[PDB]
Amino acid sequence: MEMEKEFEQIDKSGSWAAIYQDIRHEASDFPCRVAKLPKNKNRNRYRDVSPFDHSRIKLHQEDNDYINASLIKMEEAQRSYILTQGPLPNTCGHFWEMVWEQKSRGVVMLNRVMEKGSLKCAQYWPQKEEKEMIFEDTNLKLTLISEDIKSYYTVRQLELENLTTQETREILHFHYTTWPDFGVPESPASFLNFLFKVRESGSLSPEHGPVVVHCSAGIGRSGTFCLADTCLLLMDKRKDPSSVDIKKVLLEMRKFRMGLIQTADQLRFSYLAVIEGAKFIMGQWKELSHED
Ligand SMILES: CCc1oc2cc(S(=O)(=O)N(C)C)ccc2c1C(=O)c1cc(Br)c(O)c(Br)c1
Fold this sequence. Notes:
CATH class: Alpha Beta
Bound molecules: the ligand CCc1oc2cc(S(=O)(=O)N(C)C)ccc2c1C(=O)c1cc(Br)c(O)c(Br)c1
Number of helices: 8
């Protein structure tokens, strides 16, 4: 399998770090002037992680439309994602205003609220049906409707209400809960399963706004999700699946948001996910059926 073979060549030569550095060097650099405005200081989790001005998402509110989020538009694959940082105590209302204004169906969360004894993002969703959340600054209501805790992830149904208009929508929260505190997963099996669970839900589909993907910084684990998904999608769209080059797909995603894939291990893991994902697609995690 084309890339598989390259994969193995990089392993033999032990050059993941060198491959990864080439990407860091070749990546786009665009300005992030709005992100750096003194007034957005508390809207950014990390100083070194900002959205480029050209692909940033804008809040449809007057005066301060800023949120640390980017639209990654994959023209060939026909997929769009909004990669964002994990909400802060002060940006949960902005986070949901965005979900609302962008017409997203799903939110993909790839971290735990606490990891390594530290807080990785705010608790931005209700944990109990009877205890709903209200975000006064953006005038929105959010209710946990149902929760389905599984082995490697938890899916939640939430109801988001725009208090101004009393309009409501169902939002699906797909929460991968098993990313290990250090390094990356040993096998992609579970991440691939989770990705395909997200697809199944319609959250990545054209009839809805872009999916909202986040981790803590919104470039590491988050990059892996979008990169893996796009690559797989391209492999069954093209006449020559082997022609799909991950490094080049990654460089294209980085035109829209900086840092996607933060370590050589994340890179190696992404290859793995695509390779094993393609191999699954070409023959238990799913029904032997072919009803469709
Ligand atoms: C293509 C998606 C996928 O790829 C996998 C690869 C493995 S593996 O790496 O463990 N393997 C070598 C079979 C396991 C499970 C999966 C896996 C799935 O779990 C999965 C889930 C759903 Br829902 C699907 O519709 C499909 Br197709 C596949």
